[PDB]
Write an enzyme that holds these catalytic residues in place. Structure first.
Site, short mmCIF file in Angstrom:
data_model
loop_
_atom_site.label_atom_id
_atom_site.label_comp_id
_atom_site.label_asym_id
_atom_site.label_seq_id
_atom_site.Cartn_x
_atom_site.Cartn_y
_atom_site.Cartn_z
N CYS A 17 3.83 1.56 9.84
CA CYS A 17 3.43 0.69 8.73
C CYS A 17 4.69 -0.03 8.42
O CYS A 17 5.89 0.61 8.03
CB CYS A 17 2.74 0.96 7.65
SG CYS A 17 1.23 1.90 7.80
N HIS A 70 0.96 -0.99 0.08
CA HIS A 70 0.01 0.05 0.00
C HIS A 70 0.98 1.24 -0.19
O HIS A 70 0.15 2.35 -0.15
CB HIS A 70 -0.91 0.00 1.25
CG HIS A 70 -0.51 0.29 2.37
ND1 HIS A 70 -0.65 -0.56 3.41
CD2 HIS A 70 -0.16 1.37 3.21
CE1 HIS A 70 -0.21 -0.10 4.65
NE2 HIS A 70 0.21 1.28 4.35
N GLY A 127 3.14 5.94 9.85
CA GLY A 127 4.27 5.80 9.34
C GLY A 127 5.06 4.62 10.14
O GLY A 127 6.06 4.29 10.04
#
Ligand SMILES: CN1CCCc2ccc(S(N)(=O)=O)cc21
Length: 304
Positions: free
Chosen positions: A145, A41, A143
């Protein structure tokens, strides 16, 4: 003596974290040999997230649109491919710090350490459990992720989790390192329901064994029960039902403490039905299901 929610040493994972930038999205990647793994993503703009076609989106992207940085080293991307929900970026440089690793898909109720990261830099480490409904109750900011969960067997780092997203309910969802979600989640921004969460009965028993070993013994009684009988009480309070493999896994703690598993079940049965009453156990006022029997044995015997 003492009992703490302990995480594995992070040293071996710290040297594999990198920052990955594509368009203006920046998140964390895992650099192992000559491959960088990260959530796919990373390639979505904001609009894209509602309804991403990841095949079409990836086709628009060139190697040089991917900016992989490890410290002030900038790695060069020569390959890209998508494995379910993870991007694999082939880079020119194999990580000189790649440890002995493997990818494992863990089961619900298992524990792992999380190295929480921002812009490829490690910020902190915590231990947690894969909930029976395939979520984690994490600490993850924007952030975070691509932050990974792992176990250490001796010298071998077992990678079992990559963080993809927060649900509107405030819990955390992610994949194995092969890119398959734990649970019924998809990497698009849409309202997604996690199952009913249950308490991990086998882990609570492991914790009561831990308490006995550490002095706290007020909850023991001379009552007993069978599985059958005990489990029926468990379902009413939303506890996982206890199998024979569960009894088999607790045998060692049973042997150390001279308390039969069924006898411990009978003490738990009572705590559910009557609660704590301002008593605590290892200084907690609730029952605790984020230690496996293996965690308790490691912590209580001194494994490195
Ligand atoms: C932004 N992003 C990344 C891809 C997966 C995903 C899933 C849910 C949400 S949510 N419900 O927080 O908007 C956001 C998100």
């Amino acid at each position: 003596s003492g009992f703490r929610k302990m995480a594995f040493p992070s040293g071996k994972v710290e040297g594999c974290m990198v920052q990955v930038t594509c368009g203006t999205t920046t998140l964390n990647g895992l650099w192992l040999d000559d491959v960088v793994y990260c959530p796919r993503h990373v390639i979505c703009t904001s609009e894209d997230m509602l309804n991403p076609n990841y095949e079409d989106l990836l086709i628009r992207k060139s190697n040089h649109n991917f900016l992989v940085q490890a410290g002030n080293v900038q790695l060069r991307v020569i390959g890209h491919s998508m494995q379910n929900c993870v991007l694999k970026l082939k880079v020119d440089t194999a990580n000189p710090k790649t440890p002995k690793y493997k990818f494992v898909r863990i089961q619900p109720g298992q524990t792992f350490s999380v190295l929480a990261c921002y812009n490829g830099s490690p910020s902190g480490v915590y231990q947690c459990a894969m909930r029976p409904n395939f979520t984690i109750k994490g600490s993850f900011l924007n952030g975070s992720c691509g932050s990974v969960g792992f176990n250490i067997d001796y010298d071998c780092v077992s990678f079992c989790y990559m963080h993809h997203m927060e649900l509107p309910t405030g819990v955390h969802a992610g994949t194995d390192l092969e890119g398959n979600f734990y649970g019924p989640f998809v990497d698009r921004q849409t309202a997604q329901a996690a199952g009913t969460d249950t308490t991990i009965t086998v882990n609570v028993l492991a914790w009561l064994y831990a308490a006995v070993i550490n002095g706290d013994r007020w909850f023991l009684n001379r009552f007993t029960t069978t599985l059958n009988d005990f489990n029926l009480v468990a379902m009413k309070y939303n506890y996982e039902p206890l199998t024979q493999d569960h009894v088999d896994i607790l045998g060692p703690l049973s042997a150390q403490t001279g308390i039969a598993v069924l006898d411990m079940c009978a003490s738990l049965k009572e705590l559910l039905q009557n609660g704590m009453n301002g008593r605590t156990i290892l200084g907690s006022a609730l029952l605790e299901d984020e230690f496996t029997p293996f965690d308790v044995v490691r912590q209580c015997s001194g494994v490195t």
